Design a protein around this nucleic acid. Structure first.
Ligand SMILES: [Mg+2]
Ligand SMILES: [Mg+2]
Ligand SMILES: [Mg+2]
Ligand SMILES: [Mg+2]
Ligand SMILES: [Mg+2]
Ligand SMILES: [Mg+2]
Ligand SMILES: [Mg+2]
Ligand SMILES: [Mg+2]
Ligand SMILES: [Mg+2]
Ligand SMILES: [Mg+2]
Ligand SMILES: [Mg+2]
Ligand SMILES: [Mg+2]
Ligand SMILES: [Mg+2]
Ligand SMILES: [Mg+2]
Ligand SMILES: [Mg+2]
Ligand SMILES: [Mg+2]
Ligand SMILES: [Mg+2]
Ligand SMILES: [Mg+2]
Ligand SMILES: [Mg+2]
Ligand SMILES: [Mg+2]
Ligand SMILES: [Mg+2]
Ligand SMILES: [Mg+2]
Ligand SMILES: [Mg+2]
Ligand SMILES: [Mg+2]
Ligand SMILES: [Mg+2]
Ligand SMILES: [Mg+2]
Ligand SMILES: [Mg+2]
Ligand SMILES: [Mg+2]
Lengths: 149, 77
RNA sequence: AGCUUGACUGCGAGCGUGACGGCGCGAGCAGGUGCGAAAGCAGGUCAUAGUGAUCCGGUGGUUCUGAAUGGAAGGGCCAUC
RNA sequence: UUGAGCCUUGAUGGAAGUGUGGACGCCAGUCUGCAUGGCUUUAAUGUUUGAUGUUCUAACGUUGACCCGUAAUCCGGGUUGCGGACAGUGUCUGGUGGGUAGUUUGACUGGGGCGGUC
RNA sequence: GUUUAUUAAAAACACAGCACUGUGCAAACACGAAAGUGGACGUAUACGGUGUGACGCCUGCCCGGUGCCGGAAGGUUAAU
RNA sequence: UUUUGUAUAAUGGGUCAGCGACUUAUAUUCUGUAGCAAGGUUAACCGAAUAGGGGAGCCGAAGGGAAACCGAGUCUUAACUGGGCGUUAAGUUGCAGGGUAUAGACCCGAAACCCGGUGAUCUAGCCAUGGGCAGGUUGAAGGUUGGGUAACACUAACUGGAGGACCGAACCGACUAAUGUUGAAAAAUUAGCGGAUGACUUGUGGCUGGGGGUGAAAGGCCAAUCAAACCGGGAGAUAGCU
RNA sequence: AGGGUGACAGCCCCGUACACAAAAAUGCACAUGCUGUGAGCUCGAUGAGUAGGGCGGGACACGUGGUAUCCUGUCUGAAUA
RNA sequence: UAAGGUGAUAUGAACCGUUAUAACCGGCGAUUUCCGAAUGGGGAAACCCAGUGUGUUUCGACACACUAUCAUUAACUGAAUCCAUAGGUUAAUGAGGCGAACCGGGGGAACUGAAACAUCUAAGUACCCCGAGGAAAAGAAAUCAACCGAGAUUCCCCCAG
């Protein structure tokens, strides 16, 4: 009595792993009560393909926009900047919508502060390339051109 | 009727054979049990009278298939 | 008392005695051995009781057999329990 | 909880000083860790494997109450309570077993038996 | 009171009383391969078995043997 | 007939007539007989059907050895001067007979065993429901009232109406004797006898079925029977007996 | 062939050999219609609580034997040309 | 088919017939009481009692038909539980009982033989039980053979006591 699981399940469960359980536990609890199913061979492919059409399928369907920064590998036109201050140094900060101002017409338009560098944001030269939140993995690269007026 | 609804097992007749090799008519009869099986396919408890083995056959063939028989054979269930 | 293993193995003319199963006696033949200088004697004990058929099975021996064939199991044969 | 195996992090095969439990410690050591300060003899986990014990429920029991079939002391489904992997039943197995069964239990013999004999 | 209807009515059976022993109720026990049923619509002042056999005065010793009850060491011991 | 022996006073038979016991099948061997003869002969089946076909096969012409094997020899043993069993006599197939084997195997006969049925219209026990017990005695408890006690106790009348209580018909039984005993009768008649408000007696119907019932227990009863009913079946049981 | 008829019948009777016969209902054959029904080729698939095993019985002429084969009450349990 | 007829004991009576509706024989139909599977309920067989539909110049009542059980199907209904199941009614089909042997299966003795007796035998016999056909069963190889080959099942003779 092997059977494959549905839900988690105490000392064996795993959403679909391949356990061998005592007959009784099964035909008396696990099954007829939605938690497992006979390992009927017809099934070990029925619940093995998913392990293919998914764990190797949709785990690949993720890669369709590498780094998301495709043809943006040559920086972006500096429409304005991101500010400055302290007669030479830096003084001004980025509002909850002020790192787009420069790259404010490139890809698509948004306006939120998924902050990534929990520092006082260094005040020096100007043009830097960290990463920012583009996704749960990849990154991106561009620069920042101030405004002399 | 000590009979296994699923496998057809009834009682049989045999001897006892002593050390002296003594014939004594008798009966082997099935390990029956009549169990309450869940169907879901029918949201209900069909409660067959089954022999261990009859049980094992359900654990393999699947209840929906075993009830497929009987139904198709004329039996109640 | 000395030396010994004839308390041998294969056979056996010819007799006894039994309804039978069987038991018994036997010179002589072959091989091989003991004692004797030698002729020779020895196939247990002066003789006559001291025993248990067949079956089943054990043990050793032996290619006799051995179900397609080679093997083997089992079987036979000899010895024996 | 517990007998034994494997995987491991501590025992056999960023210095010196002001400071600590356990010890076959060659009989008098030194350690094994505890603070700091410019493949084989050893302890706990993750475990794998059997034993013992609590409890659990979900097989199973219910000759408790109720609902419906149903104007029904059967049965059947359903709910609830108690119990509960026990009890019970199938196969196998040891014991018991004139309760029941089939038989056996000799012959010679101055009748049979006893005695004696074979 | 009962009994051998058809050779035995008794000193035999039975009897109220007594004891022992089983039984917590789905009772023990019994009919029955089972379902079902009696026990009992009873519940230990009840129900079963065995014996004794009104009542009076009484009922001693023996637990080796057989039988029965109890015993969580060891010995021996079945399937497996 | 059985017997050592039967007029025997041991068995059997009243007499007569009819019936009434060594058969049949298949094998197998021997004798007789017929055919063919180192050969004989087919079976099933076919059929042109008592022919003819069909030689599958069986027996015989070769044995010895457990066997392999050898072969008029072979086995025994290393081998036998030898020994055992063989080589020197014709078979086979019908037919009739004699024996045997298997079958009921010459005819009749048990007590019994097993299987399936039929029986509680007799009887045992129980269940339901109905009926019966002339007549005559004894006179428990309790009750009243007197006497009685401090009050209870107690006590006398009366009252009451208990009881597997008494006597005794019906009714139920069945202790003795005589009769009967090819009876009136397969268990009674007659004269006596026990119970007779009870553990009584009886009607109707019900239920318990054979290793079963029921049994105040005799192995009693279960349809004139019971240490295991009756009927059919196994069945022509078996019968070293008569 | 056989039977009967006043005793034994080829030629008296009824028959027998032989040759013939059905409006109807049916039997069986064939030829057709109806409802069906599936036919032929190519490409596939190819019988699991099964075979096997432990235990207990039973079937095989075979009485557990050295016992193959088969069925299965109980417990188990493959491979897949 | 016909010149004779109305079965027999068993006459007689009253009749029918003789060239086609006497009788007789055969094919098909009609009628076919009650009881019996028995079927509306019952029941001590041949008898008792119904319900529902009908139906009468005399539409009280009394005559005629249907109404058992089970199974498959279908329609309509329809609980605990709201769906759904169970359940309920109605309809159409079928079954039901009987009876030789032979057949297949389920169970399955004993006497007896072994000169006792338990393994063994009698025997898978008798007997009970179920089911079926004109036959039944079996059947087209996971069969034999034996290094050549055969080619399902059934039956017969041999092999061989
Ligand atoms: Mg006895
Ligand atoms: Mg004697
Ligand atoms: Mg008296
Ligand atoms: Mg008497
Ligand atoms: Mg008397
Ligand atoms: Mg008592
Ligand atoms: Mg006494
Ligand atoms: Mg006394
Ligand atoms: Mg005493
Ligand atoms: Mg005499
Ligand atoms: Mg004389
Ligand atoms: Mg005389
Ligand atoms: Mg009566
Ligand atoms: Mg009286
Ligand atoms: Mg009186
Ligand atoms: Mg009198
Ligand atoms: Mg006596
Ligand atoms: Mg009688
Ligand atoms: Mg009889
Ligand atoms: Mg017989
Ligand atoms: Mg006789
Ligand atoms: Mg295949
Ligand atoms: Mg009727
Ligand atoms: Mg009726
Ligand atoms: Mg006997
Ligand atoms: Mg005998
Ligand atoms: Mg057929
Ligand atoms: Mg070939």
């Amino acid at each position: 009595m092997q059977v494959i699981l549905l839900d988690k399940v105490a000392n064996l469960g795993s959403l679909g792993d391949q356990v061998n359980v005592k007959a009784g536990y099964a035909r008396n609890f696990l099954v007829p009560q939605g938690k497992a199913v006979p390992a009927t061979k017809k099934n070990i492919e029925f619940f093995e393909a998913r392990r293919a059409e998914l764990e190797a399928k949709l785990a690949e369907v993720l890669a369709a926009a590498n780094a998301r920064a495709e043809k943006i590998n040559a920086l972006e036109t500096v429409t304005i900047a991101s500010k400055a201050g302290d007669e030479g140094k830096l003084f001004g900060s980025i509002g909850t919508r002020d790192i787009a101002d420069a790259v404010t017409a490139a890809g698509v338009e948004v306006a939120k502060s998924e902050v990534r560098l929990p520092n006082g944001v260094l005040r020096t030269t100007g043009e830097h390339e960290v990463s920012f939140q583009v996704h749960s993995e990849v990154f991106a690269k561009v620069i920042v051109n101030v405004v002399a007026e | 009727s000590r009979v296994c609804q699923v496998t057809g097992k009834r009682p049989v007749t045999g001897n006892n054979r002593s050390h002296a090799l003594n014939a004594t008519k008798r009966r082997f009869l099935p390990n029956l049990h009549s169990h309450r099986f869940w169907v879901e396919s029918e949201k209900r408890f069909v409660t067959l009278r089954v022999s261990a083995k009859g049980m094992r056959v359900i654990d393999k063939k699947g209840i929906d298939t075993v009830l497929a028989e009987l139904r198709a054979r004329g039996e109640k269930y």
